[PDB]
């Protein structure tokens, strides 16, 4: 997250890293046996990480649990990550308390200019890199799919949402992949690609996960 802020500790109860040796993707408990992240960010074996802040020290809330099942949706484009959609099923339940929470799936899809929370573990800098240790947290504005596709021509599907500022300085960027956009409680976007980060006119282009509940529901009753 660029232009962000350290969130307070454990305030992003639904958030999880997916570990492979390390961090390399974000992802959000929907279920306390699911979690749903990007396809982009599929690999064979997979940790989840609830109830962290600092991904680097154990501060006694983390719940580590294998995935016993990694799902894809089964129209992901992997060249233009058009349905950047996967969903991960635990070995184990998560405990759910008040560190480590479900997020709701969307009522309907976000109107332009709601208001949401974009969190991870990702690179911080717009020039270079830097990551961090504890979860950012950005505050940013769904965008109207008008200002999307003019960042973005002939780039953005049905199944793709930008959230942020065109402007600049302020998006989710590397590391960040997989993990939640929530607004009104409700998980709308899933951190999927952008030409770089925090460039002016080119915002943070996120899996439109208002799509996605049917699909979510089926793979969740299948499995
Ligand atoms: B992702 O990339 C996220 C880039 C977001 C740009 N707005 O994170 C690790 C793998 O890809
Ligand atoms: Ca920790």
């Known amino acids: 997250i660029v232009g962000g802020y350290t969130c307070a500790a454990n305030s992003i109860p639904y958030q999880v890293s997916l570990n492979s040796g390390s961090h390399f993707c974000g992802g959000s408990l929907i279920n306390s046996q699911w979690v749903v992240s990007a396809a982009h960010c599929y690999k064979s074996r997979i940790q989840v ?35 950047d959609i996967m969903l991960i099923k635990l070995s184990s339940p998560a405990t759910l308390n008040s560190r480590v929470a479900t997020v709701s799936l969307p009522r309907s899809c976000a109107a332009a200019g709601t208001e949401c929370l974009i969190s991870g573990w990702g690179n911080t800098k717009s020039s270079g890199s830097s990551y961090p240790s504890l ?87 299948a499995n």
């Not at 501060?59 to 949706?73: L, P, R, S, V």
């Not at 998006?171 to 993990?179: A, F």
């Not at 925090?198 to 943070?204: E, S, T, Y």
């Open 49 to 83: 990480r609830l109830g962290e802040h600092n991904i680097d020290v154990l501060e006694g809330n983390e719940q580590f649990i294998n995935a016993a099942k990694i799902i894809t949706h089964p129209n992901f484009n992997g060249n233009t990550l058009d349905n």
């Open 135 to 221: 979860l950012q947290c950005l505050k940013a504005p769904v965008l109207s799919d008008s200002s999307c596709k003019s960042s973005y021509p002939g780039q953005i599907t049905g199944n793709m949402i930008c959230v942020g500022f065109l402007e600049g300085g302020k998006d989710s960027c590397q590391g960040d992949s997989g993990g939640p956009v929530v607004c009104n409680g409700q998980l709308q976007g899933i951190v999927s690609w952008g030409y770089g980060c925090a460039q002016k006119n080119k915002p943070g282009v996120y899996t439109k996960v208002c799509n996605y509940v049917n699909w979510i529901q089926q793979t969740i009753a």
